[PDB]
């Protein structure tokens, strides 16, 4: 028996960890696993899924590139009676037997609360959004807005997408720095964007700025120890991958499973890094 793992991109350390979590548990339970990289492209994702259907995989674990666009691939999986579990990001359609992810609205709230307290409830905040087609991104923005709105002297002065990517985080932060001489904090919706923003800030010789990421990647934790990043909202990618395989196993054994499993989040600062 064989599991198909379709991941949005392997250019993000977060997803490399998720991949490794799935692989470790698959060995443990005696499953083969085929991991395929969608390269943030819904077309590559569909071709990846079709390859896996043709290899006769017994279950499909998918981390969608886009909430709507993924439904075609899921509905092809459905037609061939291959069970689908979504991981980290939700699908807006098709039959999905389980979804495993963080409470990303709560994660955005956590980031906002930290920033608002750290800034004594006053200042200019920049938000670097992730891929808009990812539930994770949308949810973090919603939670962040909901929490920061309670602090009227905090103004979100720029809100721009940087596609969960380090390079785009740099370039976007460059532009924002040029357009905004007063920035007191930055929330990036993932660590890769946060690291890119840091590079832009250090390049511009800005001081000065409390940078908060999302994920708890090794590079982020190192940035925090070095004092380049103030905090991150740590996720459990390896556990998400592990649970995905676990629930696949149970489902394949004829057992009913919950249809949603939340993965816990933890705020990480210098005080508790590591
Ligand atoms: O949860 C994940 C991670 O934050 C990753 O860095 C980007 O994609 C999101 O869905």
UniProtKB/TrEMBL annotation:
CDD domains: PBP1_ribose_binding
Domain Periplasmic binding protein: 3-256
Gene (UniProt): RbsB
Main location: other
Domain of life: Bacteria
Localization terms from the record: Cell envelope
PROSITE patterns xref list: PROKAR_LIPOPROTEIN
InterPro entries linked: Peripla_BP_I, SBP_2_dom
GO molecular function ontology, one term from the record: carbohydrate binding
One CC-aspect GO term: cell envelope
Protein name: Periplasmic sugar-binding proteins
Keywords: Signal
A Pfam family: Peripla_BP_4
PANTHER family the UniProt entry points to: D-ALLOSE-BINDING PERIPLASMIC PROTEIN-RELATED
Stated family: Belongs to the bacterial solute-binding protein 2 family.
NCBIfam families named among the record's database cross-references: PRK10653.1
Gene3D superfamilies attached to this UniProt entry: 3.40.50.2300
């Amino acid at each position: 028996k064989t599991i198909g793992l379709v991941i949005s991109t392997l250019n993000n350390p977060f997803f490399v960890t998720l991949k490794n979590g799935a692989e470790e548990k698959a060995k443990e339970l005696g499953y083969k696993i085929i991991v395929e990289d969608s390269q943030n492209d819904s077309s590559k994702e569909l071709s990846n899924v079709e390859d896996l259907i043709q290899q006769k995989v017994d279950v499909l674990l998918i981390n969608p590139v886009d909430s709507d666009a993924v439904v075609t691939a899921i509905k092809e999986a459905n037609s061939k009676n291959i069970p689908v579990i979504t991981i980290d990001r939700s699908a807006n359609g098709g039959d999905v037997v389980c979804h495993i992810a963080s409470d990303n609205v709560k994660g955005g709230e956590m980031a906002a609360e930290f920033i608002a307290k750290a800034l004594k409830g006053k200042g200019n905040v920049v938000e670097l959004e992730g891929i808009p087609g990812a539930s994770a991104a949308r949810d973090r923005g919603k939670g962040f807005d909901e929490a920061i709105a309670k602090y009227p002297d905090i103004k979100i002065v720029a809100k721009q997408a940087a596609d969960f990517d380090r390079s785009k985080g740099l370039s976007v932060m460059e532009n924002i720095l040029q357009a905004q001489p007063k920035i007191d904090a930055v929330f990036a919706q993932n660590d890769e964007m946060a690291l890119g923003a840091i590079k832009a800030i250090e390049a511009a010789n800005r001081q000065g700025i409390i940078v908060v990421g999302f994920d708890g990647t090794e590079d982020a934790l190192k940035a925090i120890k070095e004092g380049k990043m103030a905090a991150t909202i740590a996720q459990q990618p390896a556990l998400m991958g592990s649970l995905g395989v676990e629930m696949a196993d149970k489902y394949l054994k004829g057992e009913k499973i919950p249809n949603f499993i939340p993965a816990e989040l933890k705020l990480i600062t210098k005080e508790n890094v590591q």
